[PDB]
Ligand binder design. Structure first.
Ligand code: MET
Length: 531
């Protein structure tokens, strides 16, 4: 099937200003989309905001302003933040969008007509902050913001409350066996593997039915009405998950503004998502509820769900009220946007709760970006080594030459597999392993000495170095989008050779190609002092 590669981030609650968790999730989405664009594929990358529900509505009341004005303002902050981060996201969806609401009502009606929605009751615990139903096994004792005894979620530590309401119920219990068949038939569909195992164990134990409506007063009338019953509102999570279907059906003009909702997802060739990027905190919604709704509705299921961990800073909880802030834009103005992105994607794998420190940020910037990648770009482009300012024509290759050439040739196959898992950390590590080998080769060959002693030998060494730098930079371009352009300009790599799988091949840029012009004193990544 040739189709548009469809990658998504979660749509974020607009109860508070955007922060590092949101930036991180949308970054992963952006990187995956960018890599598929360098491969020459059609891509639709989606992000946005989750704007209905009790959580958001009560955050608006706290601030003493209307939900409409509140959500519009905070969604504006998210848009601004993501523009400042310099992503290449194709659309920003808001659940208040009138076309999204039509799609939610459509899906509801499908579920209902399929016989999978009935009027029942939920009597049980609920976390307003997570908008999540919890069993007694998933709560424990704790303290509310008055320091009085209460119950809290074991998952998140937020205050839980007991709910007893006539609700419309979705027959989730009936989808157990189909969900299990799905997980087993597609053993790569949840990443990392231990989270896949977690999902399977939970579904094995049995699934209760799920409340998909609430009484309208509980939500302060800030939600989508249930079709044919204006006393009930659609569960914010059914509403929110539907953004993925809605986005797959929106024609967007070149300004990023939605102009049209198509009738059938096949028209845009996006649905279902090839990758849903999510945090570990929202796995059950995406890996259990969502596919069950899709099965009920007769819609295709997503191919992969990738669930990452949670950031700390200086080995502590990130929080402004606690006195540990981690502002991405502040760190990006200090160290660079591409470099901050590199660090966030290099420092932690999806299976870990990563940790930022200025010390370690500087160690990676200096060690990897400046000393490994940056040093090598400067060397192979300098007037001292590359006296003709061009790609030289190589002479005969030695066995050592070819050992390096083999690593460069193998790199795209390997990086590609890692990007497709997706495991961005391993793709980056694979690229830098090759950068390190190129460096060791350059040290070994000492091209500076060759400029006088063996000009013919220098041609070979310099050519291999340039081509290694080009290939590694190409595979890093999803991670370092701005810096890869600077590097390609320095190398004088023609535009046409900066994307497409044709250019993953060793030898794509011909000898005789002229380097770009030098700028006196320019440097790609500048080292920072240990502070
Ligand atoms: C359909 S993804 C919804 C995610 C939810 N709004 C959150 O911030 O956790």
């Amino acid at each position: 099937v040739e189709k548009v590669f469809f990658v998504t981030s979660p749509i974020y609650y607009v109860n508070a200003a955007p922060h590092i968790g949101h930036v991180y999730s949308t970054l992963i989405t952006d990187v995956i989309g960018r890599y598929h664009r360098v491969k020459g594929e059609r891509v639709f990358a989606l992000t946005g905001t989750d704007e209905h529900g009790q959580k958001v509505a009560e955050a608006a009341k706290q601030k003493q302003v209307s939900p409409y004005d509140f959500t519009t303002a905070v969604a504006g902050e998210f848009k601004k933040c993501f523009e400042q981060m310099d992503y290449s996201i194709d659309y920003f969806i808001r659940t208040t969008n009138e076309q999204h609401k039509a799609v939610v009502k459509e899906l509801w009606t499908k579920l209902e007509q399929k016989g999978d929605i009935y009027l029942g009751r939920y009597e049980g615990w609920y976390s307003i902050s997570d908008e999540s139903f919890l069993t007694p096994q998933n709560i424990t004792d704790g303290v509310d913001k008055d320091g009085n005894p209460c119950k809290v979620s074991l998952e998140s530590g937020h205050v839980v409350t007991w709910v007893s309401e006539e609700n419309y119920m979705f027959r989730l219990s009936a989808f157990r066996e189909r969900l299990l068949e799905w997980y087993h038939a597609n053993p790569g569909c949840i990443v990392p593997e231990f989270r896949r195992r977690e999902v399977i164990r939970a579904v094995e134990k049995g699934l209760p039915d799920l409340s998909v409506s609430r009484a309208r007063a509980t939500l302060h009338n800030w939600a989508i009405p249930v079709p044919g019953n204006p006393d009930h509102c659609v569960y914010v999570w059914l509403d929110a998950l539907t953004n993925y279907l809605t986005g797959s059906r929106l024609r967007v003009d070149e300004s990023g503004k939605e102009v049209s909702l198509v009738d059938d997802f096949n028209e845009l060739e996006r649905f279902p998502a090839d990758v849903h990027v999510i945090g570990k905190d929202i796995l059950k919604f995406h890996a259990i509820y969502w596919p069950a709704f899709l099965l009920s509705a007769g819609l295709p299921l997503p191919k992969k769900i990738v669930a990452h961990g949670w950031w700390t800073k200086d080995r502590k909880k990130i929080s402004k009220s606690l006195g540990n802030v981690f502002d991405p834009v502040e760190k990006a103005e200090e160290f660079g946007y591409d470099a901050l992105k590199y660090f966030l994607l290099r420092e932690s794998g999806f299976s870990d709760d990563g940790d930022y420190s200025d010390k370690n940020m500087i160690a990676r910037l200096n060690g990897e970006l400046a000393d490994t990648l940056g040093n090598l770009v400067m060397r192979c482009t300098s007037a001292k080594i590359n006296v003709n300012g061009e790609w030289p024509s190589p002479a005969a290759y030695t066995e050592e030459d070819e050992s390096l050439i083999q690593l460069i040739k193998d790199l795209p196959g390997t990086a590609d597999h890692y990007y497709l898992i997706p495991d961005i950390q391993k793709a980056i590590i694979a690229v830098f392993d090759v950068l390190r080998a190129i460096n060791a080769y350059v040290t070994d060959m000492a091209p500076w000495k060759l400029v006088k002693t063996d000009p013919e030998r220098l041609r070979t060494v310099l050519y291999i170095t340039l081509e290694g730098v080009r290939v590694t930079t190409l595979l890093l371009s999803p991670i370092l989008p701005r810096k890869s352009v600077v590097i390609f300009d320095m190398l004088g790599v023609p535009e046409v050779h900066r994307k497409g799988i044709e250019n993953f091949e060793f030898g794509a840029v011909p000898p005789g190609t002229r380097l770009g012009p030098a700028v006196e004193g320019e440097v790609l990544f500048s080292k920072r002092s240990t502070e």
